[PDB]
Design a protein around this ligand. Structure first.
Ligand SMILES: *CCC(=O)Nc1cccc(C(=O)NC2CCN(Cc3ccc(-c4nc5cc[nH]c(=O)c5cc4-c4ccccc4)cc3)CC2)c1
Length: 389
């Protein structure tokens, strides 16, 4: 039943390097809108990252004429993809096709109950906020999004969406906020993790990535050290505090920092589940080596570093760790560990994760190698000022 409704060359604006790139886009009746560097001769499981389901289409003349924007709410994050064609007629042909398929797929808690503590981050369509529920004393991160531009599922290593409510102009997502401290703060304080400790953190991330891939059919895409926290027990919590942010202008405009970006994501080429395995490679590389894989100031260099410079490893690192990182950090997704049809299983069966019972990881049977210094989830120790040191 999966068929191509409309295809052709578009000009997609880079998602991280905001330049225009010619990409051949395939629109399918399942709602997938994928772009490729070259016309593909041709995983098969549809990724919701490219889905046009429940998306509003906007025709703009800024920043470039004949521009149409696809805006989608994915879980709790508003994403935008900006496209450009040569003639207005072409743009109408595309928007009508997309809107048709988007419709073809269509087949009391308030703000006063929380206390504002800290601004975690701000973006184009809203802000993220650290709150403390007055009643329970629990700590949460609240995503306040603009309503204009716009619970049943759970996993032990993902920041759970506790509840969602909306005001007259704002949509709010209340998520669990772990109080075991930022993982980069722990890695910064202890310099390097032992292979055993990194295996623990690594194993829990793999489980959550498998969940997002096989169950939710989604790519996390932003796996980095900054997006990892520990709970009071020292178990990993991958966060969901991301926001759409406009780029910043050496004279070029970039969206975020590239050091963790998979090569196929930098080039705005086709990407899949293999992206998170790169992300896992970067994270695990830093835990066991105490530094980022590629590092250079000039972004022109940093891009090349990720794109062409191949990773080298410390001699004090075990061969089992080498094999894992080497495969995880293959520049080509199809050669990358976990980039096959087996996905996560390709990694769970790796020598580095030998002896690890993967049902035990999911059920948190594994005893954490590190226990945060908190009495309870309400212990505000890792929010305090000595968090500086
Ligand atoms: C305005 C700029 C812009 O939009 N840039 C841009 C362009 C193109 C793509 C992106 C983009 O993908 N941006 C973000 C989107 C959010 N990603 C993080 C993330 C991924 C997945 C989840 C998530 N999704 C779920 C879906 C369905 N059921 C679930 O249970 C889900 C659970 C999660 C989840 C994952 C981890 C922790 C907690 C929940 C959430 C966030 C990063 C890239 C941007």
């Amino acid at each position: 039943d999966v068929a191509i409704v409309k295809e052709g060359w578009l000009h997609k604006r880079g998602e991280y390097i905001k330049t225009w790139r010619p990409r051949y886009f395939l629109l399918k009746n399942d709602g997938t809108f994928i772009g490729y560097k070259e016309r593909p001769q041709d995983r098969e499981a549809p990724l919701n990252n490219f889905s046009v389901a429940q998306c509003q289409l906007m025709k703009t003349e800024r920043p470039r004429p004949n521009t149409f924007i696809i805006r989608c709410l994915q879980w709790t994050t508003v994403i935008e993809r900006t496209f450009h064609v040569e003639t207005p007629e072409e743009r109408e042909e595309w928007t009508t096709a997309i809107q048709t398929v988007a419709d073809g797929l269509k087949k009391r808690v308030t703000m006063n109950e929380f206390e504002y503590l800290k601004l975690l981050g701000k973006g184009t369509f809203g802000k993220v906020i650290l709150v403390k529920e007055k009643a329970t004393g629990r700590y949460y991160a609240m995503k306040i999004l603009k309503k204009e531009v716009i619970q049943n599922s759970r996993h032990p290593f993902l920041t759970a969406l506790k509840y969602s409510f909306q005001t007259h102009d704002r949509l709010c997502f209340v998520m669990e906020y772990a109080n075991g401290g930022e993982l980069f703060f722990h890695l910064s304080r202890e310099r390097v993790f032992s292979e055993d400790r990194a295996r623990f953190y690594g194993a829990e991330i793999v489980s959550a990535l498998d969940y997002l891939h096989s169950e939710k059919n989604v790519v996390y895409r932003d796996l980095k050290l900054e997006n990892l926290m520990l709970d009071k027990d020292g178990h990993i919590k991958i966060t969901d505090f991301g926001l759409c942010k406009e780029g910043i202008k050496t004279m070029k405009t970039f969206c975020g920092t590239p050091e963790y970006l998979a090569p196929e994501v930098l080039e705005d080429n086709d990407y899949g589940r293999a992206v998170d395995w790169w992300g896992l490679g970067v994270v695990m590389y830093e835990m066991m080596c105490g530094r980022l894989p590629f590092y250079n100031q000039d972004h022109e260099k940093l891009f090349e570093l990720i794109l062409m410079e191949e990773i080298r490893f410390p001699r004090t690192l075990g061969p089992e760790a080498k094999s894992l990182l080497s495969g995880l950090l293959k520049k080509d997704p199809k050669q990358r560990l976990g980039g096959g049809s087996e996905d996560a299983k390709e990694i769970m069966q790796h020598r580095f994760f030998a002896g690890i019972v993967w049902q035990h990881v999911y059920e948190k049977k594994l005893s954490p190698p590190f226990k945060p210094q908190v009495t309870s989830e309400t212990d505000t120790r890792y929010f305090d000022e000595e968090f500086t040191a």
